[PDB]
Amino acid sequence: DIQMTQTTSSLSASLGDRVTIGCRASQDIGSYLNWYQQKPDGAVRLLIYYTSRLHSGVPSRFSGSGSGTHFSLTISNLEQEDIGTYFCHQDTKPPYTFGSGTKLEIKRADAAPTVSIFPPSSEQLTSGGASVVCFLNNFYPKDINVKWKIDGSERQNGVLNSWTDQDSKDSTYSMSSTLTLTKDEYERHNSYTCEATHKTSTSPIVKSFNRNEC
């Protein structure tokens, strides 16, 4: 089969900048190379077909180039709506093959997170479990760490971290860190603290509560 290789798996670029996404074929495929965009909700959209031809509702910012073996999709001036994963596709003849996609992120001005901490609900507690949640809202860049302290001691176990997709409108990220314990474990301690370290400040943003409600 014809192996399609994308230059990079992920790309970050500022609004207005020129962005190129590369694809390479293991054999000469002439002009039979297509580009699709997949959005986070999994929706797939043809953008460029036959190397260089724009499809339905595709902005003139998009262009395509190809040598038969090396291809690229170019965005002249990156826009907010261009976030997504871009896949190449050769369709010379069966079997059709695809590149593994290039995820395109918007590079943004740095933004400090807004941090919130959530004690377990009474509802969860009465059922025997306890989750404490730390939520870091609207920051950039994506890279961020959350340290949990229980009664002043670091806890790494039972911690689950997850990010949102980059915000389609303002390019920020949010994330939550969930610390899971039994109710009995939870009630054996008083102080619950999450510390958010981000490049926007050399000091950690600290949010805490005391189970004694004071």
């Binding site: 059922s127 949640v133 949102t164 969930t178 509560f209």
Partner: protein, 220 residues
């Protein structure tokens, strides 16, 4: 106008088969090749095969001969794919997509997620995320829903039945010890909450559950 409507998420045991569907509308079903494409997590896209509903001629990637079976029913304008001898490697989102004319895959289905597992369906537990008693302060409040211990994917979350969409942040699901969890948060003005019903709606298609969690102030 052209639409490809695929069937819903499926949970299937290893060794069994699944048959998924792709209802086509807005064009002449019998005059276009319908192709099927497989997307495994972090593993690109893979072409499976194609069918021409007009004469039911089929093409397959060699790999999928005897593994995937493509059919079409003209009276129903529906294309089908049956994948047998299911393994973990068959856990994927499967797309149906229309080829031609003089363009490639111009129209795509929304995808059918297949989960291959021996584990039974488990509905999520939902818990409210409410600011602590000693929290001070702001003109906006951040509220949430913790969605825990469900299987298989996906779960969708919305707020006030979809009426609340601004300031909504839903993190990606995480797989831990055989079960998924996620959380959704919303920031609303201090005069909307606790003043108004802020409900998170949690849907889990696999268990056919549609849950609500009312977000209410803590007990004083």
């Amino acid at each position: 106008e052209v639409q490809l409507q695929q069937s819903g998420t499926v949970l299937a045991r290893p060794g069994t088969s699944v048959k998924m569907s792709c209802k086509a509308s807005g064009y002449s079903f019998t005059n276009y090749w319908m192709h099927w494409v497989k997307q495994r997590p972090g593993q690109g896209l893979e072409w499976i095969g194609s069918i021409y509903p007009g004469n039911s001629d089929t093409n397959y990637k060699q790999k999928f001969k005897g593994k995937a079976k493509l059919t079409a029913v003209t009276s129903a304008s529906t294309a089908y794919m049956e994948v047998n001898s299911l393994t973990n490697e068959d856990s994927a989102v499967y797309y149906c997509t229309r080829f031609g004319n003089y363009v490639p895959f111009a129209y795509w289905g929304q995808g059918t997620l297949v989960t291959v597992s021996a584990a039974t369906t488990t509905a999520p537990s939902v818990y409210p995320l409410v600011p602590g008693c000693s929290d001070t302060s702001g003109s906006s409040v951040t509220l949430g829903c913790l969605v825990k211990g469900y299987f298989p994917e996906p779960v969708t979350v919305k707020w006030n039945y979809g009426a609340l969409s601004s300031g909504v942040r839903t993190v990606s699901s995480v797989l831990q010890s055989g079960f998924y969890s996620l959380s959704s948060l919303v920031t609303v003005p201090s005069s909307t909450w606790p003043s108004q019903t802020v409900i998170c709606n949690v849907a889990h298609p696999a268990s056919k559950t549609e849950l609500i969690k009312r977000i209410e102030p803590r007990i004083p």
